[PDB]
Amino acid sequence: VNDPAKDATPYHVEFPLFRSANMASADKLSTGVGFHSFRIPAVVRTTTGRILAFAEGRRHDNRDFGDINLVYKRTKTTSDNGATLSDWESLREVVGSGDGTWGNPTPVVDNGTIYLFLSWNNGSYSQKGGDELPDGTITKKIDTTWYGRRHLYLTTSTDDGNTWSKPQDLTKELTPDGWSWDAVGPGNGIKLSSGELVVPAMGRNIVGRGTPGQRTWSVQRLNGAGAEGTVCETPDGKLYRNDRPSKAGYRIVARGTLSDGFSDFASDSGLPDPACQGSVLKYNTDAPPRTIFLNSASSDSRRQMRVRISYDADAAKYDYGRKLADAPVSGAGYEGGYSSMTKTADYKIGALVESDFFNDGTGGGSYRSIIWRRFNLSWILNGPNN
Ligand SMILES: O=C(O)[C@@]1(O)C[C@H](O)[C@@H](O)[C@H]([C@H](O)[C@H](O)CO)O1
């Protein structure tokens, strides 16, 4: 495929944006509250061009449960595109009430309004149960009760991310009755060419019909979908789910529409995955249309981050793409894990990528940071193995 973007000089910048407690400029809230680790990134460019970057602020250690607040940064202006560290505001909080887990940021932009879907659980519960919290208490396993299940929340901003509504619990509307575990995203939702909002979630899409300023939400159930899904519209106008598999190996993919539903999910042997979240992005709709995909391109490691382009109408096949390790960051740990992508207003891919200092190996004390990257399509296309 002829691609004019290759003619641009390759461009890339990369730096830590969410700095764990061990780092020189560790990110803290204005209250003084700091965080051991930041995980689970989500990023969107708003219709103003401002960029909003979200994460889980994991207060005491790197684990998925306990006291976790939903934190964020915005770019200082609507036209800086997050190009340098000095272009980013200080850390802020969307929600951090109680001692429970607020997480799984999954934003979608609708004119303007930013809708941020979130998962929540009580601070005494964890996915497996039996985990020891910092105060000594042993968690109960997430269950099907109102009190012990994973909830689904929506918080909305109508001032370019400056302020956020009190999160609304939409579990009874948008999560099947009798579920225990749940997840939304994490990463992002999308707005279709036809106007609907589609937010990927465990076993389902959350679908916003209506119009901007008057959205109505419902569930499209997807048998065989992952817990952590991604969605985009492909050049043929259909929907594409590319989800984390339940076991390490390969991404699982399904295609469909809002009106007629989805195919079954199948392993995509072109996209190895170690059972980790990934991210997908519709980059552009005219010649040549491109879908971007980002994950760890390995069946056993999260440290093989690879960004790729598909030109196919159904995103069937991707190029080799480029290893993010070709432009490594120093002093922010070993990069790899969950990721999120947006298209900036200056026509770059903006990506957030997890990084792990590994100071406590695989244990809970290992500090986690999140790296911000900008690169043009040329950078991907001019990679050594592409
Ligand atoms: O680093 C991970 O893999 C993680 O643990 C991080 C997330 O906070 C957690 O919600 C998610 C979940 O455990 C799996 O999707 C299995 O349902 O995975």
In the chain, where are the structural domains located? 1-386
Q: Is 169 in the pocket of ligand 1 (CB under 6 A)?
A: no
Tell me if 178 is assigned to a ligand binding site: no
Confirm if 47 and 342 have CB atoms less than 8 A apart: no
Cis peptide before 274 (omega within 30 of 0): no
Nearest residue by C-alpha to atom 2 in ligand 1: 276
Q: How many CB atoms sit inside 10 A of residue 373's CB?
A: 26
C-alpha 219/C-alpha 269 separation (Å) is 29
Nearest residue by C-alpha to atom 6 in ligand 1: 64
Task: Classify residue 150 by burial, with Cβ atoms within 10 Å: 0-12, 13-18, 19+.
Answer: buried
**Phi and psi (nearest 5°) for 187?**
140, -85
Q: How many CB atoms sit inside 10 A of residue 74's CB?
A: 22
Q: Is 77 in the pocket of ligand 1 (CB under 6 A)?
A: no
Tell me if 203 is assigned to a ligand binding site: no
Q: Is 227 in the pocket of ligand 1 (CB under 6 A)?
A: yes
C-alpha 41/C-alpha 342 separation (Å) is 12
C-alpha 363/C-alpha 187 separation (Å) is 24
C-alpha 183/C-alpha 142 separation (Å) is 12
**Phi and psi (nearest 5°) for 343?**
-100, 125
User: How far is CA 16 from its chain centroid?
Assistant: 16
Question: Tokens 């971007």 label which residue?
Answer: 292
Resolution to one decimal, Å: 1.6
Taking the CA atoms of the chain, what radius of gyration do you get in angstroms?
Answer: 19
Nearest residue by C-alpha to atom 5 in ligand 1: 64
Per-residue DSSP letters for 175-235? S-TT--S--B-SS--EE-TTS-EEEEETTEEEEEEEETTEEEEEEEE-TT--SS--EEE-T
Those residues with Cβ within 8 angstroms of residue 243's Cβ, 6 or more apart along the chain or in another chain: 200, 225, 226, 227, 228, 229, 230, 251, 252, 253, 254, 265
Q: Is 56 in the pocket of ligand 1 (CB under 6 A)?
A: no
C-alpha 296/C-alpha 91 separation (Å) is 27
**Phi and psi (nearest 5°) for 332?**
-125, 20
Compute, in angstroms, the gap from residue 38 CA to the centroid of ligand 1.
14
Those residues with Cβ within 8 angstroms of residue 32's Cβ, 6 or more apart along the chain or in another chain: none
